[PDB]
Automatic annotation (TrEMBL):
SUPFAM superfamilies membership: DR1885-like metal-binding protein
A Pfam family recorded for this sequence: PCuAC
InterPro entries: LpqE-like, Lxx211020-like, PCuAC_sf
Protein species of origin: Thermus thermophilus (strain ATCC 27634 / DSM 579 / HB8)
Name of this chain's protein: Transporter
Matching Gene3D superfamilies: PCu(A)C copper chaperone
Length: 120
């Protein structure tokens, strides 16, 4: 919550999670449609919601078709909110290394980042 700040939360498998602060320096908007990583096979952008059922508020996660960001704008993939779900962990994971990550955007854009391995 100041610059491009993110991390990947590991597991022994079959699934895991990844997060970041994300922002647009351009004069047209960004639309973030996924990511891509060496530590997982399946990877998906999800939300976390509040939603009513019995009139009472219930909370949980689900995939979204995308996220997006206005020009000169910013968002954060907060764990109580938007994030990546990971499935089929194609590497075993050891704490205190990094995950190379390709953030996927609508059309011919992908933006490469590198972010640390949290164990949790």
């Amino acid at each position: 919550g100041s610059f491009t700040e993110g991390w990947v939360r590991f597991s022994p498998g079959p699934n895991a999670a990844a997060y970041l602060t994300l922002e647009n320096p351009g004069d047209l908007p960004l639309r973030l449609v996924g990511a891509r990583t060496p530590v997982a096979e399946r990877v998906e952008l999800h939300e976390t919601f509040m939603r009513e059922v019995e009139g009472k508020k219930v909370m949980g996660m689900r995939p979204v078709p995308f996220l997006e960001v206005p020009p000169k704008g910013r968002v954060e993939l907060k764990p109580g909110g938007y994030h990546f779900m990971l499935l089929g962990l194609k590497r075993p994971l050891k704490a205190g290394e990094e995950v190379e990550l390709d953030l996927l955007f609508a059309g011919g854009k992908v933006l490469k980042v590198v972010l640390p391995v949290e164990a949790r």
